[PDB]
Structures are given as structure tokens and as C-alpha cells.
Amino acid sequence: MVDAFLGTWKLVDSKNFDDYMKSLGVGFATRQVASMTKPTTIIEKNGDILTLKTHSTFKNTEISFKLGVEFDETTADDRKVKSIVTLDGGKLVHLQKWDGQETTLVRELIDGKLILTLTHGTAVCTRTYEKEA
Ligand SMILES: CC/C=C\C/C=C\C/C=C\CCCCCCCC(=O)O
Ligand SMILES: N[C@@H]1[C@@H](O)[C@H](O)[C@@H](COP(=O)(O)O)O[C@@H]1O
Numbered sequence: 001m002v003d004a005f006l007g008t009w010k011l012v013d014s015k016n017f018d019d020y021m022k023s024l025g026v027g028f029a030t031r032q033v034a035s036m037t038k039p040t041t042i043i044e045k046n047g048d049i050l051t052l053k054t055h056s057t058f059k060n061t062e063i064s065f066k067l068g069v070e071f072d073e074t075t076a077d078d079r080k081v082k083s084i085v086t087l088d089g090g091k092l093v094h095l096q097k098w099d100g101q102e103t104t105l106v107r108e109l110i111d112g113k114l115i116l117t118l119t120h121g122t123a124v125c126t127r128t129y130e131k132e133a
Pocket of ligand 2: 073075076
């Protein structure tokens with residue numbers, strides 16, 4: 001049910017990422033570089049296991065998980081969180097919990113583009129990714 005998300009995607013638009021990073025306590029110098037970075041995200045499956053790679057000239061991450069099963073994660077900004085990824089309304093919903101805080105990373109396909117919505121506190125960031133062949 002995750003198959004249309006699979007593949008290699010590149011960032012082509014970003015709105016409010018600085019607000020999102022600042023809400024998470026990311027320092028100004030990291031926000032500055034991040035605001036000019038265009039990651040490539042690779043989403044692959046093997047059976048029930050998804051692997052999500054985020055690559056860039058700055059930070060790089062990789063997670064593997066089963067939908068609906070909690071996993072430990074250490075984020076690009078070094079938060080140690082408890083995570084779960086599920087499908088909800090056709091959207092891939094990633095919830096991170098740490099210190100009583102929460103953030104969601106929600107991916108949906110709209111007109112063939114992958115729209116990533118990042119919410120923490122009041123901050124709502126929308127990042128648009130485009131396929132790669
Ligand atoms: C690996 C991500 C690459 C570049 C971004 C660099 C620093 C971002 C700063 C804080 C990380 C916040 C949590 C992760 C955001 C991922 C956004 C995305 O996948 O587009
Ligand atoms: N295992 C950790 C990750 O949990 C953390 O996310 C990352 C920070 O980002 P970067 O690797 O780009 O420094 O360092 C390691 O790879």
C-alpha cells in the first residue's frame with residue numbers, strides 16, 4: 001500500500017523550513033546551510049521493511065522500519081526519538097516522540113509530486129519533492 005512512494009525524489013520547493021528547524025532548537029548556522037540544501041530522498045521496500053535514505057551535501061540519514069512498529073531513531077539534528085510510521089488516508093505518517101514532545105513528518109502524493117509536511121509546535125513546513133527516473 002506504500003508502492004507509489006517508492007523511488008528517488010529530489011527537493012524542488014520548501015516553505016517554512018526555517019520555522020520548523022527553529023522550533024526544534026536547531027542553531028542558526030545549521031539552519032542557514034539547511035535553507036540552501038536540496039536533499040535527495042530514496043524510499044525502498046523489501047518485504048515489510050521500508051528503508052528511507054535522505055542524502056545531501058550537508059547531512060545524511062537512513063532509517064529502516066516496519067509500518068506500525070515502533071523504532072528508535074537519531075535524527076539529522078541529533079534528537080534521539082521513538083518513531084512509528086504508518087499509512088493513514090493514503091499518507092505516509094511518521095510520528096517522532098521524545099521528552100514529551102512530538103513532531104510529524106507526513107508524506108502524500110499530489111499530482112505525482114511528494115509533499116512532505118513537517119509539524120512541530122505551531123510550525124508547519126511544506127516541502128515538495130519531484131521524482132527521479
Ligand atoms: C538529512 C537532511 C538533509 C539536510 C537538512 C540539514 C539539516 C536539517 C536540520 C534539521 C533536521 C530536521 C529534521 C529532518 C528534516 C528532513 C527534511 C527533509 O527530508 O526534507
Ligand atoms: N547514527 C547517527 C545518526 O543517528 C545521526 O542522525 C547522524 C547525524 O546526521 P549526519 O550523519 O549527517 O551527521 O549521525 C549518525 O549517523
